[PDB]
């Protein structure tokens, strides 16, 4: 019916209304793939067809009113679903959505509707969200990265090797002149960029303005005394609206080059405007991300990784933070790879093998840039850049600031370990196996690296391969 | 243990942290690059038009904004379209060498997938200051 | 330490650092109790002290430049933690905080310090919050709700019984005439309040801003044709911040009465500067909840509904919304009676046979009413109001929009369901048992009742008492 | 090329650069359907293949500086052509332009590409614009009829 | 700088080229003797490159592309968009730094764009420079329609 | 009663209602402590049940419509007295308010029902405040100094010794060029800091635009001619608001470092506001204090100096006036010591030897620094530097100013007086005694400094001891 049906009183079968198998799709079509369990005796294509109808229409019990409106064309479509080879009551359920539903790069509208609505159900005992078809006409209303891949190469200045850098701690409370000190010796030792945590940026006594100016003091410093180009990451974290707009707005009066904010972890529209105003204002922007075990580590009772990176990419960032290998983060190949080929490349198929069910028709959409930090340095480089290459932006947790020397020979042993890394791939050693080789011979005259490989003679981990949710 | 300060000297960007490197092993490494699928391209710059600055923004009502200066390299005459020979570009290297004393020689490359440049090595001139 | 440590180079153990189970709290300390599973070899000391080093201080490799901050009384302290008997490896941790920390009522800066940096931890398996201590000069810093329940109720000119109300439905794309005509007969028939659905709101041609012209016209004359004070809660939902605040600019202009929105499925600071706004500007603020299979069900592993209820109530709501009884979010008996307690509420202590560990010490916070969304109903009103009495917001989705008589009629069957269940109530019967049958008698002469008792004959569901997740 | 091509000095044959009669379009792309009469001496097949080529990159002399910018996908390609039956020297061309090429959702940008540079030139005696592809992606960022005829029916009441 | 013609040179390929290399390309014409060059709509603004960016990597360029030869030169930057509040903020971002002289492409775009622009372009003491295009189906109407003098004066 | 009680018509006596001498307080409870004497026939309950209820409720004859509102925990409550040892008729008050009664952080709600209403009562003959308990969340939604101590020692970028300076004199009205010269050759001299007074301000021909503007002429080579981070406080007055926010945002543009305001004589909201823009602008804020002998010196019959300096720190202020050692404001020991140690202090318990009734906690709040004024120089600067120790920011009165020799000399007279003291004080010296023969050793070659000791060589007196009000 495209309206005026008068149902006979009841609920009608979900399987008689909302499953098609033989369905064909638009190219206006939204689609979802979920892996799903239901509970214990209900079908599951009465489970996949209630959720693409509570998602689209929704009934409790339907008369004649639900005939006012147009359903025909207009409705979800639950698509034919599969079972899980791992679990025997796990299966994929295929859902298909028309553009007529949705308001135009609506992402809340869009989050509740995918989301929110259908990762309730009481007879649902677990959804797993595994992949998204997003039609080019919802993509390019969307605004995807403000200052992407191809964009950040030319703005940067720099680059031909990683991009280096160093997470800030203690996080806890650092006084404004002694982080100012620190700030400066690690840029001016060596490393490109510097990074700030939520609990730096702001403190009781201390307010963000003010370590924003001993900021902007070691700044000029740390390029006008090296002649190299450097920054630092400003993380602007706060607690309104009101207050993220006066974080921005002030630090517009200096017009500094790339800062980051863990407003992502504060809210998506936040994100999405902040992302609209970086664009026009012809900033960079870093987007921070966290929540690993509840949120991105939801084995198979929610969100993943390639729906994340995916989502991510669909709000937007021009850098974008990505495993701490160890501790915190991710640092699985089977996790990570997808998951920056995901943010790196555009114009690429759907491939089971690779977790991707669906196809969002790419050309034209920027590549954004993997934040990695970086838990553990010198011994875990040649494995690092054998499989990364120049993706990162690598901001170490303990280089530089675990050196017992100093921030200065810290940052240059790191910035050492980075070129000799560099040069060594640059004569297409094999990296693996010639990298330990590569820094034992590095140390002999590096004395800051020698002093490096001393201090760090006890981590040797490369990375895991296989998931640990 | 240590004192840490580049004496008389200053670090020129990516590649002078290390020891500097001879044209054999700069041949090598372009061989290498060249075989991977990116493009070179020989430049130069006056020794306080490599060194970077933000002095132009006395001109501007807008800063910082992004903005910066004195980071820019003149070509050497071509990129390297076309003919790839690295003895081609050792050669170009000495002519402008030999033009320059004071200006610094450098190498570039490009990834033409992205578009995206590649800043490599090595920051030289015929005055090149204090060895670290 | 207040500072200046030599400390030599690696990690030293967080039991002999972030770890003092003879520790008393201060008035300004901030505490939070976890429910945690390690993984299989690693010590829950040595797991409850580094979640307190990682969000305190964080380290990959320490040395005398961590000894630059004041450690003092400014770091996080894991106190004495205890078993859990429902499981072999599960135990519950409780850390502490001082003030000086965290900036003051800084949301995404104590979101991401207290569960962004801590739920991420390879080493950890799963991890839920169980409880919270925010002392008094973070809870007046926070800003709460902006006209709860003390305000709320003689702001809306009408109380007595619970208020009345209904979910409009199909969610898919009702053209604006047809929702005009069933809100006006609903309204007009019995409803107090009616409510949109995410998608209602926005369509590729129908405009908010032309749907809420419908209303407008609409509901000059649901009240004025009426004489009774009713309306509807607008949702109000937006892609982007500057979208959000379009839809509430344009809507001041009319200055109509109370609205709800999803902006809280959105992000934390969002609804914070709205609450501010809402404050600002006199209004009543109703706050949406989605997302129950994935965040409100997160079993061992996440968040749960004390929390959540804590969570939501320190950014702050009117009204709340809250269990469906039947389908996308709860109603079970041990699940909503604190989450509505913790909502209702002030000056009450800690109980652990109600889950509760901490108390935040109250006096002058006011509350915020639950709203549920109402599945079934005329034979399930007798254990609604047995159970709840005379908190909701009751909105129905199987009431009115179900009657084949219409929406007149359907709202005149609820209307005269919930006036005959609160009749009953005020008489002082027996209620759980009388119901049945108050119900039959009332059905003499309301013909409406009548057929709504014959379409929903099937309808007898209580809750459910115990938990499912 | 992607970029790096050290082109001979001069002017290379549009109809071996601008012209695929077997290009398999996008669902991304922008199409145009035009109907044009050459100037006496110019091959059907060059005017199509020139008129993709100045609306896409232009020339007027190239050398190894043209090899700068990213030409392989990114540039407009002229398809396949057919006659007019009501002129001889009449015929349509069908030309073809990747999303890449033009600001999204630019009206002065479309406009100018589009029909300012290309209803100029001298060796054009007439053409004619017959029809136009817009992409999805174009078409929704366009931003359309304000309160069209789905709306005005129930706004005029 | 006045007597004899202003030399300058028309910016191509139309299609899409990267800033670095757009920024040596004017850099090294302006400094080996050119006075002006001109952006074409496209050159303006792409998918992957703002024109707030394309402005930043002029900026670099211009300032020593003046400062490096000793001669007063520049750059008309083209200024082209699809809404007017897109022409606003491409003029007034453009009126912080207070560039010397631009074009439009606007009187392809509307005739009282252009003119609003005129009075703007008084109000703040820059130079403008007009852009024309449609020849065929303007200008070369034979019999029927729009002429060359009459174009003149409208334009005028 | 919680509300609804119909009270019989007439007064009930306030010892039967506002008088609960074993109340426990909550730790959201504001307290005040008060040193009274009734008039003839009056008990010290009543007066203290009164003034609480008077203060809480009011009333002139009560009866039912008095049970419209809820007391039960909301009202005030006088707690147990205590007699007062030096008069027959002289008690303390300690009265007790819940959160409840005021409005959250407003300083014209609690200071008109504190003090407004109290400080009235005609059968009150004196009424003297003693302390106050101001509770965290109330310390918290007041906003404190904008940049103090701990921010102030960073921001300043000079520390080791005290801070030297001088007050510009003579008020009338010296014209812009010539006090241009005076301020130059005294900055040259060695001072760190000068200052204004309300009338070097403004007077009706040289407005402080153009006197701002010999500042900005002289501050630039008193800065850039010396090497020596100087500046100079603008005091900044004025008629209006509309005035003062035109004072403050004209120098905004230029930035001046640091300025003070007499604002705190003018209006305590109108300073409050100002220290809020001055944190958002991040500047520094010095705040002047005056009326020492109408309100500073109210010996039992009103304000005090320990309040006074709870009440300066409760709006806030970065530097705050302080002793003139002669002249118009206190110089004496149990006067001064207690007054810098509640404004520069954090963290310490209630002692009665130190008058200290009730502690205000703790944990988190911003120090302000004392500035003197300094009208004694070069003998009394042992003493004032034994005493006193690197507080101050001494801003002297015959320094500078009153050295035949001219600004220069006078100046360096000043600062080598500083930093022979301060070299005496970092040998350990025995300051009291060996300061004498220390500015005879200088006297050798500083000639300036013979000269200072020839013009003052009368004055050789230290402090009293004992308030002198």
Same mark, same amino acid.
């Given at each position: %019916? ?62 004649? %009113? ?66 998204? @078809? ?46 100012? @000190? ?217 280089? %530089? ?31 693996? @196996? ?14 800051? $690296? ?18 640990? $949710? | ?132």
């Amino acid at each position: %019916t495209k309206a005026g049906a008068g149902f006979k009183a009841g609920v009608k079968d979900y399987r008689l209304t909302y499953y098609t198998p033989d369905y064909v799709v638009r190219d206006t079509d939204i689609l979802a793939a979920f892996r799903m369990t239901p509970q214990l005796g209900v079908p599951p294509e009465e489970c996949g067809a209630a959720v693409a109808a509570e998602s689209s229409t929704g009934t409790w019990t339907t008369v004649w %009113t639900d005939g006012l409106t147009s359903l025909d064309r207009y409705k979800g479509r639950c698509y034919d679903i599969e079972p899980v080879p791992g679990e025997d009551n796990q299966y994929i359920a295929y859902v298909a959505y028309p553009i007529d539903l949705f308001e135009e790069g609506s992402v809340t509208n869009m989050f509740t509707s995918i989301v929110g609505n259908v990762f309730g159900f009481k007879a649902l005992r677990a959804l797993r969200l595994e992949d998204l @078809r997003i039609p080019p006409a919802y993509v390019k209303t969307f605004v995807g990265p403000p200052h992407g891949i191809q964009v950040e190469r030319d703005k940067l200045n720099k680059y031909g090797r990683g991009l280096l850098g160093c997470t800030i701690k203690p996080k806890l409370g650092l006084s404004a002149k002694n982080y100012g @000190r620190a700030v400066y010796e690690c840029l001016r030792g060596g490393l490109d960029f510097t990074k700030d945590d939520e609990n730096v940026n702001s403190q009781p006594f201390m307010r963000w303005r003010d370590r924003f100016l001993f900021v902007a003091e070691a700044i000029y410093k740390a390029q006008a005394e090296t002649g190299e180009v450097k920054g630092h990451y400003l993380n602007a974290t706060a607690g309104t609206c009101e207050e993220m707009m006066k974080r921005a707005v002030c630090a517009k009066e200096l017009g500094v080059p790339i800062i980051m904010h863990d407003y992502l972890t504060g809210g998506f529209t936040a994100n999405t405007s902040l992302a609209i105003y970086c664009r026009d204002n012809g900033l960079l922007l870093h987007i921070h991300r966290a929540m690993h075990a509840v949120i991105d580590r939801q084995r198979n009772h929610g969100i993943h990784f390639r729906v994340l990176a995916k989502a991510l990419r669909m709000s937007g960032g021009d850098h974008l933070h990505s495993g701490t290998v160890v501790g915190k983060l991710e640092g699985e190949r089977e996790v990570t790879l997808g998951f920056v080929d995901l943010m790196r490349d555009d114009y690429v198929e759907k491939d089971r093998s690779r977790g991707i069910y669906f196809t969002q028709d790419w050309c034209s959409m920027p590549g954004v840039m993997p934040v990695a930090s970086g838990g553990i340095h010198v011994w875990h480089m040649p494995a690092l850049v054998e499989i990364f290459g120049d993706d990162a932006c690598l901001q170490f947790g303990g280089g %530089t600031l675990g050196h017992p020397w100093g921030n200065a020979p810290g940052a240059a042993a790191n910035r050492v370990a980075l070129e000799a890394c560099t040069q060594a791939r640059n004569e297409g050693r094999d990296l693996a @196996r010639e990298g330990g080789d590569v820094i034992r011979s590095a140390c002999k005259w590096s004395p800051e $690296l020698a002093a490096a490989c001393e201090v760090w003679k006890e981590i040797k981990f490369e990375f895991d391969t296989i998931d640990k $949710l | 243990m240590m004192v840490w300060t580049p004496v008389n000297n200053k670090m020129f960007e990516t590649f002078s942290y290390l020891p500097p490197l001879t044209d054999e092993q700069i041949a090598a490494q372009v061989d290498y690059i060249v075989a991977n699928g990116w493009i070179p391209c020989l430049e130069f710059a006056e020794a306080d038009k490599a060194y970077v600055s933000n002095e132009s923004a006395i001109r501007f009502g807008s800063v910082s904004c992004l903005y910066y200066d004195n980071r820019y390299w003149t070509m050497w005459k071509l990129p390297m379209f076309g003919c790839r020979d690295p003895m081609q570009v050792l050669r170009e290297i000495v002519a402008c060498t030999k033009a320059f004393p004071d200006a610094y020689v450098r190498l570039v490359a490009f990834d033409n997938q992205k578009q995206v440049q590649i800043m490599g090595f090595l920051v030289q001139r015929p005055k090149t200051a204090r060895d670290f």
